[PDB]
Scaffold this active site. Structure first.
Site, PDB file in Angstrom:
ATOM      1  N   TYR A  74      -4.724   9.143  -2.724  1.00 43.35           N
ATOM      2  CA  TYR A  74      -4.818   8.280  -1.562  1.00 43.35           C
ATOM      3  C   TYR A  74      -5.106   6.853  -2.031  1.00 43.35           C
ATOM      4  O   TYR A  74      -6.135   6.596  -2.674  1.00 43.35           O
ATOM      5  CB  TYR A  74      -5.924   8.781  -0.612  1.00 43.35           C
ATOM      6  CG  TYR A  74      -5.664  10.163  -0.079  1.00 43.35           C
ATOM      7  CD1 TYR A  74      -4.938  10.343   1.093  1.00 43.35           C
ATOM      8  CD2 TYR A  74      -6.113  11.294  -0.754  1.00 43.35           C
ATOM      9  CE1 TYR A  74      -4.664  11.605   1.578  1.00 43.35           C
ATOM     10  CE2 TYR A  74      -5.848  12.564  -0.271  1.00 43.35           C
ATOM     11  CZ  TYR A  74      -5.127  12.712   0.892  1.00 43.35           C
ATOM     12  OH  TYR A  74      -4.866  13.977   1.378  1.00 43.35           O
TER      13      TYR A  74
ATOM     14  N   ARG B 259       3.548   8.651   3.374  1.00 39.79           N
ATOM     15  CA  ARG B 259       2.962   9.854   2.804  1.00 39.79           C
ATOM     16  C   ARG B 259       3.975  10.542   1.931  1.00 39.79           C
ATOM     17  O   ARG B 259       5.202  10.453   2.188  1.00 39.79           O
TER      18      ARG B 259
ATOM     19  N   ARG C 195      14.268   6.597  -7.624  1.00 40.74           N
ATOM     20  CA  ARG C 195      15.245   6.353  -8.683  1.00 40.74           C
ATOM     21  C   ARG C 195      14.858   5.143  -9.540  1.00 40.74           C
ATOM     22  O   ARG C 195      15.497   4.835 -10.548  1.00 40.74           O
ATOM     23  CB  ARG C 195      16.658   6.247  -8.117  1.00 40.74           C
ATOM     24  CG  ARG C 195      17.348   7.604  -7.952  1.00 40.74           C
ATOM     25  CD  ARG C 195      18.677   7.478  -7.216  1.00 40.74           C
ATOM     26  NE  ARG C 195      18.500   7.005  -5.844  1.00 40.74           N
ATOM     27  CZ  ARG C 195      18.768   7.724  -4.757  1.00 40.74           C
ATOM     28  NH1 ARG C 195      19.243   8.961  -4.869  1.00 40.74           N
ATOM     29  NH2 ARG C 195      18.567   7.202  -3.554  1.00 40.74           N
TER      30      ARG C 195
ATOM     31  N   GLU D 130       6.660  10.295  10.396  1.00 47.26           N
ATOM     32  CA  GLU D 130       5.335  10.799  10.656  1.00 47.26           C
ATOM     33  C   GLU D 130       5.063  10.843  12.153  1.00 47.26           C
ATOM     34  O   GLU D 130       5.568  10.034  12.922  1.00 47.26           O
ATOM     35  CB  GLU D 130       4.316   9.889   9.970  1.00 47.26           C
ATOM     36  CG  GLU D 130       2.907  10.213  10.378  1.00 47.26           C
ATOM     37  CD  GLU D 130       1.985  10.332   9.212  1.00 47.26           C
ATOM     38  OE1 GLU D 130       1.794   9.311   8.482  1.00 47.26           O
ATOM     39  OE2 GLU D 130       1.460  11.460   9.034  1.00 47.26           O
TER      40      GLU D 130
ATOM     41  N   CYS E 272      13.423  12.019   3.870  1.00 50.22           N
ATOM     42  CA  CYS E 272      12.470  11.097   4.509  1.00 50.22           C
ATOM     43  C   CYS E 272      12.389  11.299   6.006  1.00 50.22           C
ATOM     44  O   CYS E 272      13.388  11.112   6.724  1.00 50.22           O
ATOM     45  CB  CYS E 272      12.895   9.649   4.270  1.00 50.22           C
ATOM     46  SG  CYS E 272      12.857   9.188   2.568  1.00 50.22           S
TER      47      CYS E 272
ATOM     48  N   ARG F 188      -0.151  16.138  -2.281  1.00 46.69           N
ATOM     49  CA  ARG F 188      -0.085  15.098  -1.253  1.00 46.69           C
ATOM     50  C   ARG F 188      -0.435  13.734  -1.817  1.00 46.69           C
ATOM     51  O   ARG F 188      -1.299  13.612  -2.700  1.00 46.69           O
ATOM     52  CB  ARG F 188      -1.034  15.407  -0.089  1.00 46.69           C
ATOM     53  CG  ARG F 188      -0.533  16.440   0.904  1.00 46.69           C
ATOM     54  CD  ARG F 188       0.576  15.865   1.788  1.00 46.69           C
ATOM     55  NE  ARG F 188       0.439  14.423   1.996  1.00 46.69           N
ATOM     56  CZ  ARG F 188      -0.428  13.848   2.827  1.00 46.69           C
ATOM     57  NH1 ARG F 188      -1.261  14.583   3.552  1.00 46.69           N
ATOM     58  NH2 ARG F 188      -0.458  12.525   2.942  1.00 46.69           N
TER      59      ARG F 188
ATOM     60  N   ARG G 179      -8.695  10.537   2.824  1.00 46.43           N
ATOM     61  CA  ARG G 179      -9.266  11.480   1.870  1.00 46.43           C
ATOM     62  C   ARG G 179     -10.205  12.458   2.569  1.00 46.43           C
ATOM     63  O   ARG G 179     -10.859  12.110   3.552  1.00 46.43           O
ATOM     64  CB  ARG G 179     -10.015  10.736   0.761  1.00 46.43           C
ATOM     65  CG  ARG G 179      -9.177  10.420  -0.466  1.00 46.43           C
ATOM     66  CD  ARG G 179      -9.862   9.370  -1.324  1.00 46.43           C
ATOM     67  NE  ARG G 179     -11.304   9.574  -1.339  1.00 46.43           N
ATOM     68  CZ  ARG G 179     -11.953  10.259  -2.272  1.00 46.43           C
ATOM     69  NH1 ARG G 179     -11.287  10.796  -3.285  1.00 46.43           N
ATOM     70  NH2 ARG G 179     -13.272  10.392  -2.201  1.00 46.43           N
TER      71      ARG G 179
END
EC number: 5.4.99.5
Lengths: 117, 117, 117
Positions: A108, A90, A63, A78, A75, A7, A116
């Site tokens: 993070y 994220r 890229r 959230e 993509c 993550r 965190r």
């Protein structure tokens, strides 16, 4: 061979393509450095953005990374959480690795440091 | 050893932290019970919520499972389907396992029982 | 063997169940054809749709594929990007395969051919 998710989270100050891509690249670079990740070992990646970011798919940053042109990425949006961190990007990077779960280095950055554990 | 996704779905009656956390926790516990899943064998988890839920990230419930503190998780918005189930939380838990695909035990609780194949 | 993601993208002209299912089924069948994929080797699948599609979950198309009834799938909302392709459906199909990352056959149909890198 075993596979593990890595993550990452970061934030941008403004919704622009320049800033989204810059902060996304910096987040990816940090994940790669801390986990010694080679692109051929990446199963796939999932990037997400809070619904206050619209300028560009953060996947475009991938890229900008030499050798990562074959890593599959998509993509998503959230979840919109009341009082949640704004302007947040994220990453869930799924990789072939023998590193134990406890030792995987999740990253993070910026204002996402608050996320965190 | 092969990797397999295990699906879960549940609902809450209202958009509150207590409801989201309790119902997410119960869904995870049920998946863990039926599949004998150990956290170290979990690659990653993806949680989603319909766009009528905003009170808290369901991932917070994962930290209420002793031993699961290193399992990487991210949340996302489920698509808004007209006539689709409201107030719904879903899980995709990716695990290493030898259990054949047709024997994996996917879990549907609360109002989500209607989503069961 | 290793685990790898296979990407697909397509578009629909209208937000109707019939078109969403037809274009999704067509995209899945093309991915399966080009990659010789057997359902038992699919870890899991993620389908996404842009926020302008509501008629049906694209995952429903998976269930009209003979032999794919045990493949776990979930749906999510694609990130909303200004000027992005409208009415777009994407898939990320995670499979066990011997095929090298650079030789995986990602599939882009209809108006999504422009996403081809």
């Amino acid at each position: 061979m075993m596979i593990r998710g890595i993550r990452g989270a970061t934030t941008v100050e403004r919704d622009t393509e320049e800033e989204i891509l810059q902060k996304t690249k910096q987040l990816l670079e940090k994940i790669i450095e801390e986990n010694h990740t080679k692109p051929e070992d990446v199963v796939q990646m999932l990037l997400s953005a809070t619904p206050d970011l619209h300028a560009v798919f953060p996947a475009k940053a991938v890229r900008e990374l030499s050798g990562w042109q074959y890593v599959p990425v998509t993509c998503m949006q959230e979840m919109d959480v009341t009082g949640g961190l704004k302007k947040c990007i994220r990453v869930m990077m799924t990789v072939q690795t023998d590193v134990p779960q406890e030792q995987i280095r999740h990253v993070y950055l910026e204002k996402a440091v608050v996320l965190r554990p």
